[PDB]
From a paper:
The absence of a strong signal for the BBCP region prompted us to perform a classification with a soft mask around the BC domain of the particles aligned in the framework of the full tetramer. This unsupervised classification produced a class with 9.4% of the particles showing good signal for the BCCP domain fully engaged in the BC reaction site (BCreact) with a closed B-lid. The BC-lid is closed grabbing the MgATP where the adenine of ATP interacts with the main chain of Lys200 and Ile202, and the side chains of Glu199 and Lys157. The polyphosphate chain interacts with the amino group of Lys116, the Mg2+ ion, and residues 161-164 in the T-loop. This Mg2+ also coordinates the carboxylate groups of Glu274 and Glu286. Bicarbonate is placed between side chains of Arg290 and Glu294, and the main chain of Val293. In our cryoEM map for BCreact state biotin is placed in a catalytic position very similar to the one described previously using free biotin. The interaction between BCCP domain and the B-subdomain lid of BC is stablished only when the lid is closed through a set of point contacts, and the large tip containing the prosthetic biotin has a wide range of positions available. Noteworthy, the highest positive correlation corresponds to the BCreact pair joint by the BC-BC interaction surface, suggesting a cooperative behavior of BC regions in opposite layers to recruit biotin-carrying BCCP domains.
Author numbering:
A (entry chain C): 472 to 1057
B (entry chain A): 0 to 90
C (entry chain B): 662 to 852
The structure:
């Protein structure tokens, strides 16, 4: 109330009506989650293969709000509709609700445990399969981790309710994927081996990523025993004819069901999905209509009517989906400070190949610096830096390397031959040297050998798997150190979160000891505090509701402290809070 | 054996039965009307539930079906009526 | 002269038999009876589904020999696939907008319909590199018209439910909030 939410500009708290609850026509059906629980992963794969209709995966809970709302969507708005999604849409193959930037961002900004969100959603969605985005050898963090950490995370995530693991590598490298695939198979869940699509397969001018490359990569992915082959189109680069040809050549190569995930950045997501559907794709990644379009996924309501009378229909209840979209439209208005720019079909993504989350994150990062007025120059430098690096796959975290490298290039007025000439003395950013040293793996075709020695001058490079060279982590001593740090015995999930995000988890624990469970608050109250003469009700437990009324905000004293006159549970309680704007000791 | 008791009353007598139940090692459930949201007895129990939504508050405290529904959904094993409202109610 | 058929209902849905395929065929015959040069098909509310788009254009292509001009909106988010369905059926001209002023209640993008039809049986006759350079101007000019922006726009398949054209959607919602019915605008759309 007095200092505002950090990172956004302090508004007043707008009056928001209650979001519209859906009027659902329930239909009891057997889902893929039931088949996995009773008969295992192979029967789920056979059920997917025996479905003539194209299956839908809901990316509303992870990817739609990662692309549009800067992954700031909270568990309160999720749990307001999780039961309605689980019951009204049993036709969904899975719901992607975890992984990616969600794990870090929830702890860092939302001050809620992603494990807690997973537990609440699993209790609220018993018949819907849960899908996570697994980033290969670096499961949710950016730095590389040992193999025991990866299998421990896979075991704990599978135990807590994650059923489908979309496992991908930043550079499409099999040694950084097959261990995670084996661990997911051993835990009794479904492994989704994923190819990151880049470039154009129908463009002869770029033969580095042609159809034979994807064919052999799919062959080696099928050789690892993964249940479902996935094709991640990170930047919406898959053109519809290219989609049809790629899905056909992947369908006549491997026997695995094909999962397609694309973005609507160029505005061609719906037609790309339909072209893959004609070629025989099995599951496509869609979002709800109110969180679709732009950098996000195509709408599931739109993709129903796009294939309504074709050879293959979409398996979804479109009336229930349209009813749930009313709630999603209502709760999108809470996240107005986190809204991105004005949406439009951006076909320039075919040039620079920036992922949408990488696009908006780099735009904010370049807007922090005064250089951000030439964002077109930044995008051109991104394209030319990607070409100079050897046309690498630009996804998290390799897209961050390209973005930082190009921003360093036009930040100090560098050029390709210029950075070749002066690269002996230049101090490159940490992402570029860590990429060229091999910490993100080995790219296809290798590094540019002259540029590699120019980028990293004295530090040792590695050509093998970074997980082989990772320092050994023992869970008992880490658990004891964490118990010393947080003051209580931690769970396996708490230790696992401490390993990958040490400072982030500790700062989350400090925020938990200072402010408590702020995830139970509603989003306008979470973001804008409390208004004068406002009444809110906070349900902290089943049967325990906190009645909080803000009666009067006092004037700041000479020490900068303000006294807020709250009415907690009928009784007056004066809370002293320091105003950061008011200078102290005056 | 009883583990949880609901009080189908308000005010002083509800707090008295809550204190007796806590001395006897029992969980306590409170019920309150919307107009009684600032009553002490709501916050003196382990669980509190709104009853008689939309009715007059005295009629809310005389709602047999809502009180029984709250006691059943809260896991309460017994109902203490206190005095006045439904203590002598045969139905 | 561009004689125009306004499209309503759903030709592929038998529960609405008034505007079936034969009605549009007879109307196209009547319009070709006049000296009209090009037959125009107006989809003011974006109701033409892509499967219906392929069916309607093909049944009009063998009925009349006039060129078919298709105009639609992507309010439902299906404008591009509708144009691609009509391109396979043999449509001649389609109505597109620049990318910075496309999407929502507007037309599907000119730049995105090129890449959708790229490497297909029929390409889109346009210079997409020149169109992308022009779209930078319209992106900058649209910032001048911030007070007239509709708001946060998403694909809306409820336009299949109420069949409100996009011009009527922005206008009628303005009057409902003006009189005091903006909070019940959903019930206005239901009725
Ligand atoms: C309101 O209806 C609560 C009951 C208050 C009156 C009843 S009537 C009998 C009890 N004796 C008394 O003084 N008050 C109680
Ligand atoms: Mg199938
Ligand atoms: Mn994505
Ligand atoms: Mn029009």
């Amino acid at each position: 109330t007095v200092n505002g939410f950090p990172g956004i500009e302090n508004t007043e708290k707008r009056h928001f009506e209650e979001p519209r609850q859906p009027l659902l026509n329930l239909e009891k059906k057997k889902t893929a989650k039931n088949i996995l629980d009773e008969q295992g992963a192979d029967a789920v794969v056979d059920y997917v293969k025996n479905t003539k209709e194209v299956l839908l995966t809901d990316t509303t809970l992870r990817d739609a709000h990662q692309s549009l709302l800067a992954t700031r969507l909270r568990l309160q708005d999720m749990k307001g509709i999780a039961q309605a999604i689980d019951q009204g849409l049993p036709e969904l193959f899975s719901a992607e609700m975890w992984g990616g930037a969600t794990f870090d961002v929830a702890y860092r900004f939302l001050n809620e445990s992603p494990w807690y969100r997973l537990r609440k959603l699993r209790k609220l969605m018993p018949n819907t399969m849960f899908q996570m985005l697994f980033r290969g050898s670096n499961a949710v963090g950016y730095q590389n981790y040992p193999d025991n950490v990866i299998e421990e995370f896979i075991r704990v995530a599978a135990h807590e309710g994650i059923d489908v693991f979309r496992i991908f590598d930043s550079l499409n490298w099999l040694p950084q994927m097959e261990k995670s695939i084996q661990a997911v198979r051993d835990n009794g869940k479904i492994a989704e081996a994923t190819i990151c699509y880049t470039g154009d397969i129908l463009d002869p001018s770029r033969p580095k990523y042609n159809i034979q490359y994807y064919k052999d990569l799919a062959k080696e992915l099928e050789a690892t025993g993964a249940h479902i082959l996935a094709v991640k189109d990170m930047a919406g680069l898959l053109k519809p004819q290219a989609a049809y040809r790629l899905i056909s050549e992947l369908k006549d190569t491997v026997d695995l069901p094909i999962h397609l995930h694309t973005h609507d950045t160029s505005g061609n997501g719906i037609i790309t999905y339909s072209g893959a559907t004609q070629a025989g794709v099995d599951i496509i990644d869609v979002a709800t209509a109110s969180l679709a379009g732009g950098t996000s996924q195509p709408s599931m309501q739109s993709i129903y009517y796009a294939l309504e009378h074709g050879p293959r229909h979409a398996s979804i209840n479109v009336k229930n989906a349209e009813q749930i979209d009313h709630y999603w439209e209502d709760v999108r208005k809470y996240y107005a400070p986190f809204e991105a720019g004005i949406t439009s079909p951006q076909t320039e993504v075919y040039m620079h190949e920036m992922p949408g989350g990488q696009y908006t994150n780099l735009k904010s990062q370049a807007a922090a610096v005064g250089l951000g007025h030439r964002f077109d120059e930044i995008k051109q430098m991104y394209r030319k830096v990607n070409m100079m690096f050897g046309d690498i796959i630009k996804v998290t975290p390799s897209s961050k390397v390209v973005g930082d490298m190009a921003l360093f290039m036009i930040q100090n007025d560098l050029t390709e031959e210029d950075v070749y000439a002066r690269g002996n003395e230049l101090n490159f950013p940490e992402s570029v040297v860590s990429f060229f040293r091999g910490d993100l793996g080995q790219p296809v075709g290798g590094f540019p050998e002259k540029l590699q020695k120019i980028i990293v001058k004295d530090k040792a490079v590695i050509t093998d798997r970074p997980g082989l060279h990772a320092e050994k982590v023992d869970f008992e001593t880490v658990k004891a150190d964490l118990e010393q740090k947080i003051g209580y015995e931690p769970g396996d999930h708490e230790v696992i979160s401490y390993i990958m995000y040490p400072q982030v988890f500790l700062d989350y624990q400090k925020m938990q000891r200072e402010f408590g469970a702020v995830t139970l608050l509603d989003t306008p109250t979470f973001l804008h505090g409390m208004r004068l003469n406002e009444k809110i009700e906070v349900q902290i437990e089943k049967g325990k509701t906190l009645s909080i009324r803000l009666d009067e905000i006092g004037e700041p004293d000479l020490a900068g402290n303000r006294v807020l006159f709250f009415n907690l549970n009928g009784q007056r309680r004066e809370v002293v809070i320091n105003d950061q704007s008011v200078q102290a000791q005056v | 054996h009883m583990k949880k008791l609901l009080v189908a009353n308000r005010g002083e007598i509800a707090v008295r039965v809550f204190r007796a139940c806590n001395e006897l090692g029992l969980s306590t459930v409170a019920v309150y009307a919307r107009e009684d949201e600032y009553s002490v007895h709501r916050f003196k129990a382990d669980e509190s539930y709104l009853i008689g939504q939309g009715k007059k508050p005295i009629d809310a405290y005389l709602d047999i079906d809502d009180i029984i529904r709250v006691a059943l959904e809260s896991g309460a094993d017994a109902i203490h009526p206190g005095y006045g409202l439904l203590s002598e109610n045969l139905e």
